[model samples]
Target chain A: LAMTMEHKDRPLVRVILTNTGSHPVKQRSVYITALLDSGADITIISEEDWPTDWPVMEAPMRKSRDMIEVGVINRDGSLERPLLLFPAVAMVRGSILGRDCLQGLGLRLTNL
Target chain B: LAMTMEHKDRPLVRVILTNTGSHPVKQRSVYITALLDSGADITIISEEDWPTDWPVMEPMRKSRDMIEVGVINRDGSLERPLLLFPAVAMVRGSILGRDCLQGLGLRLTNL
Candidate 1:
């Protein structure tokens, strides 16, 4: 909902992690408030604020990006997000927005 | 979250589904709301209420029964009913609760 900076908006959603994911790279407590996005077919976090030593799986090859209007579902209801990233290099290690993330974090999509 | 039946126990979070899962068997709309449970592990739904056409996946074998009275997140906040089943039988469906059910209907956790 609030942003530290603004970017060109194609489509995006805000994601708040009740649980903190410390920067694996920084090795410091990093309060992560990211985008709950589907457009990011592959979930990416800040290269500057990523975690380290996480088992990294390289993609078959560098891939192209896709875009979509991410939907955020809160207790009130599902809403759309307003931020966008380019190249969309997945910074958050491992399928951050995959089936397991949903399974692990209990992420409910406002509209899937 | 409120329950029509009282199966939502600890470790069991009620789920509501916005997307309806149609029964593959009857070919009718089956509004599903059972439970979101991690206790069961197998992710089960009713044989009668499950949808058809979903190419089923088989399990290693069968599983032993388990029970854990755990946590109920929202029924309101950060909680879960992610996985569990009435009984782990890949035969039909999954752990039914509020979110999945409420998608059909919302108790995110409460009134």
Candidate 2:
């Protein structure tokens, strides 16, 4: 969306996610104030913040890649799962948006 | 340039910074094992880590950003130097990039 704040030290912004995914869901969405970490190879979410039931898996092809996550929900209220079908895994950080997650969103560090 | 470790809390890495800028430089490079602070708004080098004679200025565009700055240490001056040209930051660590190295001198609180 539009930026409401000016460019300051490591810019941070609020992002939202939902409980529904490739499987099914019956929960509310979550809003997170994530750090735009260009230094972070992967985006992270706290174990406490992630949905307890959502599947977590390892990324084989991306195992060598840095930064982080997947799953998308459209503005029209549609759920978009990851392109790959890995075993799904959980992240341990409290939540720092990494390059991997940004890449999944079709964004990248260099492009920015 | 690759991931070398795994499954740990608060991952960090060793990064190297050179003295040469897009402009020029005439000193030795520096290496540091810094925290991959996703919570940090910008990269930081203590007044001690930085060169003693570099030029410092208040960026009019970014003065209103966040509170976690190097100035919190009571350094009296918001005069952190701005390397007119970008420096080379090694991507060898857990994190690295052009954007990764921006926001110099400003520090952030705990994640």
Q: Which candidate wins on DockQ?
A: 2
iRMS of every model, one decimal?
Answer: 13.7, 9.9
* Regions of candidate 1 where Cα sits further than 4 Å from its true position: A1-25, A31-50, A54-112, B1-33, B37-93, B97-99, B103-105, B109-111
The TM-scores of all predictions, comma-separated, are: 0.24, 0.38
lDDT of 2 by residue, B20-111 (tens): 33433344455455454444433554444444334334421211112122211122322232332322232333222223434332222111
How far does residue A19 in candidate 1 sit from its true spot (Å)? Answer: 12
lDDT agreement with native, every candidate: 0.31, 0.38
lDDT of 1 by residue, A1-102 (tens): 211111222122334322122323323222343442221234454554333432233443222132212233443444433223222335343222322222
All DockQ scores: 0.02, 0.10
Q: Give the TM-score of candidate 1.
A: 0.24
Model 2 misplaced stretches (Cα beyond 4 Å): A1-10, A22-28, A57-93, A104-112, B1-111
Chain B only, TM-score of each candidate? 0.31, 0.39
Best by lDDT: 2
